[PDB]
Structures are given as C-alpha cells and as structure tokens.
C-alpha cells in the first residue's frame, strides 16, 4: 500500500526483530485514563509508520520516547485484572510518549510476556531512534515527497492534474520514482537565477544517508523537464552549441567565490556524482543541471551547524564559563496564575536538550510535597512522580550534568521526604560529597563538565531547612548575591538589569568566577519571555525561560545552543574570561564608543528565494533581515515587495553593515507577507557559522518546526579592511593569539611541477612568497639548488554574464618577495569579472 | 604578432604512431581553439580535429576517427595530434590554426559557433612509403 | 554537411568581375566565408559571414547560395580560394577553385 514511510535504509533492526513486530505479539495494553486494560495484539503495518491493534491506530513518528518500567502502570492491577503470576513490574511493560504539540503527552503502554515484552522495547526503540534521527536531518525534501505521496494516495494515486498544483502549476496513475523525479525538474528548471550564475563561468563544449538526498532514466528526465517548462511561469529556464564547466572553472570558483579549496582528486570526485547525463560526465564537464544540482546538495547550506557534532577538547575546562539552556517554572502549561502542570512536560525540557529545571516544593496534604504555582488556581502534581519521571529522561540525549534548583515552601519533616525520595532515585547519580582533589586546594575551582558526565547536581541554601536536604548541596548554594566558587546567586530579571546598567566590568568579572541565573519577572502572566542577549553578553550563563511560548526570543535561545552538538555546553567568549585577550576586563558591552576598534564590513546579499509562502499561493513576499547583537550594532532592513509570486521570488538585494564583536551576534532572517503583516516563515542563525560565497538558507514556521520546501538563495562576503597603521583589528583585539594561529588558510596554486596543474598548499597567517615557493619545490631534490626563476605572478582573468561583451585579456603582475600571502587572497573581489589565480612563472 | 610553429612531420612507414606539436604565443592559448588542416598535394583541404583547449572537448572528422589522437596543454601553449597506426593517405601537409567563436545566444541559454580561421601555421610535410 | 565551389576553374583578363557559386546542401545559418591560397604557402582569410575584412572583395547570399564577387581582376590574383561553414563543430570546405589569366 505504498512506499516506507520511514525509508528502508535508515533503521538498524535486525531481520528478526522486524519480522517480529511485522507478525506481530501478543499484549495487553494498559489504559490509566479509566483504569482499564485489555488483551490486545499489537502490530507495525507495512510501512513502518504505525501501530494498529485490534480497533485503533496510532502515528509512530509522533513518538518521542519509550520507557520499560513506567510506574505510571499498576503491574499488581493487570495481574488481578488478567489472572496472572506475579509478573515484575521492571521487565514486563514498556510504554509510549505520542503527542502532536509541544504539550501533549499522551501514553500508550503495553504489559506482555517475558520475551516478547523484550522484543517490543528493543524493536521500538530502534524505531524511535530512526525517527528522532529523521527529524535533525539538514535537507528533508525526499522526506515530503513521501509524505505528500502516502497522503494524496487515500485509495487513489496523485493524477498528474494534482500533481501539479502540488508544486504551483496551472487521470493516470502516477508512480512513486516517477513523482520524485517530478519534483527534480521543479527544483532546476524553475531557478533563472541558477542559469544567469552558471553562464557567469561556463565555457563551451561538446551523518546523513546519500540514497536520502533528493538532488546527489534519460527518456523520463526529458519528459519531465518539459512538463516543468510548461508549468512553470517566470524565471523558468525553458542540440548545438551547450556549455560546462571543467576541472579548472570548478576550482577558480572554489578560491575566488566561496573560499574552499580542493585539491584535484578531490575536485574531479566532486564532479563525478552530480552529473545527470552520462556522457557528459566523462569528459570531465558539469552541465547545467549540473551545476544547479551542485548548488542545491546538502554539503552547501548557509549554517556550519547543520552537520555538527561534540568538540570534547573545549568541554574540559571549569563550569563558570560554559552557557547553559535553562528553563523557569517546568511544569507550568499556561499562565502563570491560571492552568495545569504536566509531569510528562518535565521530559520535553530534558529531551530537547536542557540542563536545568525549577521545583516550587509547598507542604504536602497528606505528608508527601506537592508542586503547585504559589496561591492560584493551578493544579497540583505528585512531587515523587517528577523526581522520577526526571530520573528516567535524565541522559537520553546528553551525558553532561544538569542542574536542578530547589524552592522550598515544605516543612522540616517533609523536607526530609525529598532528601530521601532524591537519595533513593537518583542514589550515586546525584553527587554525594566532594569528588577531585582540586576541589580540597587553597584555591578551588569548578571541575568541567565532563568530569561529571551524565551526573546531576541540586542547587538550594546550604547550612553553614532539615540537615539531611542541605546536605546533599555541596557546589550550588545560593547565597543571597552581596567558597566562593559554590556561591551562586539568582536575579530577577530587573535586578540584574539595572546591574548590568550600572556595573559592567564588576559583573562581567564576577561572571568569570562563579554561577549567576535569570528569570523572567513577575508581571508576565501569558510568559512573553525577554530578550535574553542583554543578558548574556554580559556572562549570565543560566537564563532560564518558558517552553511554551512562540515566540523571538525563544527562537534566539534555541539557536544559540545548536552549537556543540546541542549539548547545551557552549563556550562564553574568550574575550570576557580569557585574561591573554588585550581586551580582556576592557570591554564593557553597554558602551557606545570603540575608537581603538576596526569595525569589519559584511556584505549579504539577499538574491532570490524559492517557495518562501507556506500554503499561501498568491502573495507580496519580502525579506526582513535583523542584525540582533549588542547596542550599537542593532539594525534591520528589507526588499522591496514583489507581486503574485512565491514559488521564486527575485529581490536581489544586497545589505552592507558593519559589525564589531564577531563572536556573539545573530542574524534573523524573516519572510514577511507584505499584505497581512503575517510572518509566515523564519530562519535564525549565529554570525560566526555563515559560510560564505554562495549558500543556502532552510527555513522554518512560527512554531520553529523544519521547513523543507522553502528556501532562501543568499550570497555573504566578509570584507576586512587594512589594518593602515595605529589600530588592531577588532577581531584581532576581542581574542587571543591562539584563534589566528589555529586558523591557517589554504591557497591554490597553478603550475606546480608534476602532472596536475594546481596543488593546494596549507599556509599559516604570517607566510610570505618564499616559503610558500619553497613548499612549491621543497618536494623534489632533483634540483641542484633553488633556482630563483620560479616567481609568483597574481593572475586575473576577466569574464561576466555578457559573454558576448569584449574578452579582455588576463591581467599579471610580479610578486613581492616579502609579500603576504593572506592580504593577496583577501584581495580578490569576483564583482568585476574578476577570478584570481596564483601561479607559478620562470 | 601570432605564431604558429608546427614540427615532427616526415615520412614513416604505414601502421607506424607519430604526433604533430603547435607551438603558440601571443594570443592567450587558454582561450582559443587550436586545429590541425591537412592537404593532400593535389587536392582540396582536410579538417583533422577541434580541440577546445580549457574546456576539453574534442571533435574529430568522420573519416579518421580514433588512430588521430588531439590533446593539449594550456600550460606550455602547445598542442599535441598523437596519430596511431599511420596509413598512405597519411601523406600530405599538416597545417596547425587558431580561431575564435561567437557566441549567438537566443531566447534561452546560449550558443557557440566556430567563427574566422584568421590565422595558420608555416606548415610542415607527413609522408608514408612502404 | 556538404560544400560546393562551383566553378572549379576559370581564365579571366585583369579588372573584370570574378564570381563564385558556393552552395550548401542545407541552410547553414551565416557561417561561410572565403580563404585565398598561393601555392605554396599557407592559405589565408578574407571574409567571415558575408563581406568583412583586399578592397574588391565582398560577399553576399540568397537563399542557400554563398557566393564570392571580386569588382576588378587583378594580376595577382592567381589562387585557390575555398568556402568553408561549421554547423556546430564540424569543419567543411568546398571544392576549392583556381582563377587564372585567359589568352
């Protein structure tokens, strides 16, 4: 009845597992709504996208986690209920989390034998493993596709009428591969702008699985690519004399435009894949579906985050210098005054990546405490419930320490009851006493994060409340902000505002030392969340916020930690704690003058986006870019509005501005029905992982859900002006000397000797002429000595889209021995017609 | 100022290998196509092959495909016509030219023509006797 | 492809009018022109489509016709002259022709 829903090559079961939940098992499914259950025999229908039993179904990949053991379920109950044997509880029932939102936590759990409870668990969660992996992919079209398929086949297949209003066009049945390649022909043939690109460079002629990605026979692609001709309207690119491009155009474009450098093996594999013709792949061209399928590919979109992983070697330094995501009042759903409190809400904070967590304890009814939004109208939660229902989700995703903040509204006897409810579930888990023996030093400091992986930690008053609680309390005390390691202090947030304001280099200091969070305030009562970047640009590390609310600066924490894997553990800016920074304790953000600083110029050019009007056909689309960041760097801007387009709409406009501190600012980019006023899509990302050259920028809804479809085709150059004479880079003044050495550079050089004509050479920032010809020669002892007649000659062909315009000829020019390397390549502007090269000449 | 210099002619016996060099200068070898025109004596004119220099594609005649082998080199401006298996009819002129194109672009992508021969070689002799 | 060059020869006396016929077997655009050649040495060119640079010389079309007119002979003009197109990447001449003196 279709395709995989999830595709084949993407789980991990084992042939007998599969088979297994294929067939089938027997179970007993366990309802808490009504305290019912039922004997019931579970199955995966065919394509890997549910669970029907029998009379009900239930969406897979609404699925966020399963559990063995939930003690949510009374195992004592089923077995009265069913006449049963004692059956244990911790290996006989395992449990689904299935909710649509970011709220709803609906369960499903199942109680069956021994063996085939074991089966079950250790099929579904493969299974969730798949889905939650589908879900952080960069590019997702195919997954769509999919989709929009199994849909639009209930009990018929897509016609082709259908088919192509699906994509924005003017009764047989479709097959599945011949509707991907559909969508191809709409993703190349429909991008002028793509052509007027590739005719820039043309001359004559003539991690993520790869099968996933749409875009990596001859009869079909030529009716396809016809159809889309006539579909399409504007910007469509609708034998004798066709272009390429060779392993020499490919690579100019790679060092001049975008700034990779490949070495030849690598450029030719690079060509091999993308070539839809056959013959043309041969010869060693890319055609111009070609290039246009380069462009699109997964290895090209804008965030250097979308493919990111743990760097363990910066995780090793102590704990007051790392962010951390937060969240305030965990259970709350809705206002703060008026609402429920879900436990199950307490795993989305953990499993989306948190690391810290609020508990408003108050004096139980019965002995046992209760959490509940001081004196209102929200409902109440069992407090060992939460403990646990933490226990269980603690590490999933990450398996560095969390936090979690403790308020105290209990009695002493109750208090107790959470000191033993904590040393019971948690046990080792929680840290106990003091662990290294750094900590017991004249001078201690926070040990790392990854010392005390996948621990936790409980932050609350320490004596110098019941015993047994404080206790358990060894490098969190909250100490009313006036050793001093362990004192962390809260603010509210108009508290540290106002300390902010009137002390910059005191707080930022102190920040360097020790913990200091941040909430919300009181007022809210819908949770409209602050702009936390006042905040962190200072160094409050914990700026905790509300999970339910859609809005910017929600958005802006969320991004701020794709970083790093999405461990939560970013860190701060060298500048505020880094004492060999030249800036280091110099640098107040609050400040509005930089004299002695080298603003750095961007320069973004917003081209032409496609398919940036969700569901919304006709339509005045513009692009609202907003450099969020310090105080003196804030600016917005705009297109200009185009008219009933928004499958490619063409602005074509470009942003120039000055910036200052590279490290901490984040652009947001934003589609804007330019008759509604409706945000209809959005895209944030921080500024130091735009790559540059040419890129693609993925979207996303209101409620920070991925986009496929969507997409904007933008292109960003960092310019650096000369430093002249007096003053240091800005850059080169926020950090250490550490950063530049690390970041060597690559230049492509022509005419080395050997077989290919270009063979890239890996240089630092303080290389000359010399030293790079010597590494052009130092490979050979053929030579009796170093000739001098092998100089450096900066080439500069000319060409532009007009082809047909003048031909000049290649520019040339000696190189300075004593040259710098690094200022010629930062030299090279392709905005002329210009495409540099750097060979070698006797 | 354009010279073409073309050498390695001379006589060979039939079934033997041989290739014809063309030394340039002047125009930018890296973008223009060079050819290779024989004549035997006696006769009309001969187009031997076009080889697009950067880009790399090659068009042969549709007489002697394969035993003439075109490559070049844009590094050193030369050209390279490897000839395999050498047969009588072997026996003529070689002449090595430049040209240019002219783009002709119409509603859609664009399009080249090979434009002017506007230039040749001294000129240099093949023979084969058996 | 194909070419012609008709005639193949001819005998002419010095400042009359000296025409060639060059017809190609299809229409082939405006890619035809006329290479002159004394014996000897390497021909050379003398005009890319129609006309365009010899101050007697021109070159104009009808139809599939491609033809050469010289307005005055003169003595030197003793050649061959050829007729060349390129459909794409094709190279093909005409049969070639040879003026001469007449007595």
């Known amino acids: 009845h279709g395709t995989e829903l999830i595709p084949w090559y993407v789980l991990s079961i084992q042939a007998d597992v599969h088979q297994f939940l294929l067939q089938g098992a027997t179970v007993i499914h366990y309802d808490q709504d009504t305290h019912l259950s039922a004997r019931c025999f579970l199955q995966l229908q065919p394509d890997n996208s549910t669970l029907t039993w029998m009379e009900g179904i239930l969406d897979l990949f609404s699925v966020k986690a399963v559990y063995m053991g939930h003690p949510g379920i009374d195992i004592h109950t089923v077995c009265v209920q069913n006449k049963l044997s004692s059956m244990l509880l911790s290996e006989t029932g395992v449990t689904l989390l299935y909710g649509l939102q970011t709220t709803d936590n609906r369960l499903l759990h199942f109680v069956a034998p021994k063996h085939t409870a074991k089966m079950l668990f250790s099929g579904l969660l493969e299974l969730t493993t798949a889905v939650r992996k589908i879900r952080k992919f960069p590019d997702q079209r195919q997954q769509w596709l999919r989709k929009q398929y199994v849909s639009f086949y209930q009990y018929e297949g897509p016609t082709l009428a259908h088919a192509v209003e699906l994509f924005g066009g003017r009764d047989s049945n479709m097959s599945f591969i011949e509707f991907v390649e559909l969508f191809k022909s709409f993703s190349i043939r429909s991008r002028k702008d793509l052509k007027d690109i590739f005719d820039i460079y043309s001359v004559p002629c003539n991690l993520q699985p790869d099968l996933d990605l749409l875009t990596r026979s001859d009869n079909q692609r030529q009716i396809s690519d016809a159809i889309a001709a006539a579909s399409i309207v504007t910007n469509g690119t609708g034998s004798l004399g066709i272009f390429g491009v060779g392993i020499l155009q490919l690579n100019d474009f790679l060092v001049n435009c975008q700034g990779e450098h490949c070495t030849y093996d690598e450029i030719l594999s690079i060509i091999q894949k993308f070539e839809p013709n056959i013959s043309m792949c041969h010869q060693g061209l890319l055609s111009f579906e070609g290039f246009a399928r380069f462009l699109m590919d997964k290895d090209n979109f804008a965030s250097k985050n979308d493919e990111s992983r743990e760097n363990k070697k910066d995780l090793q330094l102590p704990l007051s210098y790392y962010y951390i995501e937060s969240s305030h009042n965990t259970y709350l759903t809705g206002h703060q005054l008026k609402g429920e409190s879900s436990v199950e809400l307490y795993s989305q904070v953990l499993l989306q990546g948190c690391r810290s967590i609020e508990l408003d304890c108050w004096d139980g009814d019965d002995g046992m405490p209760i959490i509940y939004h001081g004196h209102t109208l929200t409902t109440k939660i069992p407090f060992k419930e939460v403990v646990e229902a933490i226990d269980r989700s603690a590490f999933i995703t990450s398996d560095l320490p969390i936090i979690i903040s403790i308020e105290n509204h209990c009695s002493l006897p109750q208090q107790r009851k959470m000191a033993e409810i904590f040393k019971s579930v948690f046990g080792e888990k929680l840290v106990a006493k003091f662990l290294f023996e750094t900590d017991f030093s004249d001078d201690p400091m926070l040990p790392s994060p990854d010392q005390l992986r996948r621990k936790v930690l409980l932050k609350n008053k320490k004596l110098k409340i019941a015993p047994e609680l404080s206790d358990l309390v060894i490098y969190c005390q909250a100490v009313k902000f006036p050793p001093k390691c362990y004192h962390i202090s809260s603010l509210n947030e108009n508290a540290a505002k106002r300390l902010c304001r009137r002390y910059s280099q005191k707080l930022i200091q102190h920040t360097a030392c020790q913990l200091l969070r941040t909430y919300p305030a009181a007022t809210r009562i819908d949770s409209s969340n602050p702009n936390p970047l006042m905040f962190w640009l200072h160094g409050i590390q914990l700026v905790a916020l509300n999970y339910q609310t859609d809005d910017l600066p929600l958005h802006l924490n969320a991004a701020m930690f794709e970083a790093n894997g999405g461990c939560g553990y970013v860190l701060k800016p060298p500048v505020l704690w880094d004492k060999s920074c030249p800036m280091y304790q110099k640098f107040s953000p609050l400040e509005r003058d930089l004299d002695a600083m080298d603003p750095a110029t961007y320069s973004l050019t917003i081209i032409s986006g496609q398919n940036v009007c969700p569901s919304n056909s006709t339509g005045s689309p513009c692009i609202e870019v907003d450099v969020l960041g310090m105080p003196l760097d804030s600016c917005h801007f705009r297109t200009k509005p185009i008219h009933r387009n928004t499958l490619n709409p063409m602005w074509n406009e470009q942003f120039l501005f000055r910036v200052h501190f590279e490290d901490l600012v984040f652009l947001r980019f934003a589609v804007v029905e330019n008759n509604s006023s409706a945000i209809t899509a959005q895209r944030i990302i921080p500024l130091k992982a735009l790559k540059r050259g040419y890129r693609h920028l993925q979207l996303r809804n209101l409620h920070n859900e991925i986009l496929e479809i969507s997409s904007l085709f933008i292109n960003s150059r960092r310019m650096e002006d000369n430093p002249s004479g007096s003053t240091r880079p800005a850059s080169l003044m926020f950090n250490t000397e550490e950063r530049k050495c690390s970041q060597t550079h690559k230049v492509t050089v022509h005419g080395v000797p050997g077989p290919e004509p270009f063979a890239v050479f890996t240089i630092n920032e303080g290389t000359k002429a010399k030293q790079l010809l010597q590494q052009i020669l130092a490979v050979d002892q053929d030579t009796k000595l170093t000739a001098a007649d092998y100089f450096l000659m900066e080439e500069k062909h000319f060409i532009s889209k007009e082809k047909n315009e003048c031909r000049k000829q290649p520019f040339q020019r000696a190189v300075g021995p004593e040259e710098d390397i690094v200022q010629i390549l930062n030299s090279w502007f392709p905005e002329e017609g210009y495409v540099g090269r750097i060979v070698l000449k006797p | 100022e354009v010279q073409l210099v073309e050498s390695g002619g001379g006589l060979v016996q039939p079934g033997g290998s041989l290739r014809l060099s063309c030394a340039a200068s002047?125009?930018?070898?890296?973008?223009?196509?060079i050819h290779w025109v024989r004549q035997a004596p006696g006769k009309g004119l001969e187009w031997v092959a076009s080889?697009?220099?950067?880009?790399?594609?090659?068009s042969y005649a549709d007489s002697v495909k394969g035993r003439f082998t075109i490559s070049a080199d844009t590094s050193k401006n030369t050209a390279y016509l490897q000839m395999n298996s050498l047969r009588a009819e072997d026996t003529a002129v070689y002449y090595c030219?430049?040209?240019?194109?002219?783009?002709?672009?119409?509603?859609?992508?664009?399009?080249?023509?090979?434009?002017?021969?506007?230039?040749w070689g001294q000129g240099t002799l093949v023979t084969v006797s058996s | 492809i194909q070419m012609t060059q008709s005639p193949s020869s001819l005998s002419a006396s010095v400042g009359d009018r000296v025409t060639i016929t060059c017809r190609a077997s299809?229409?082939?655009?405006?890619?035809v022109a006329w290479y002159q050649q004394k014996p000897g040495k390497a021909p050379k060119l003398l005009i890319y489509?129609?006309?365009s640079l010899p101050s007697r010389f021109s070159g104009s079309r009808s139809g599939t016709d491609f033809t050469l007119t010289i307005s005055s002979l003169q003595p030197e003009d003793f050649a061959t002259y050829y007729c060349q197109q390129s459909s794409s990447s094709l190279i093909t001449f005409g049969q070639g022709t040879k003026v001469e003196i007449k007595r």
């Open positions: 002047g125009f930018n070898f890296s973008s223009s196509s």
């Open positions: 299809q229409s082939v655009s405006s890619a």
């Open positions: 080889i697009s220099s950067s880009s790399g594609s090659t």
């Open positions: 489509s129609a006309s």
């Open positions: 030219a430049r040209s240019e194109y002219s783009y002709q672009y119409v509603y859609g992508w664009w399009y080249w023509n090979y434009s002017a021969i506007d230039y």
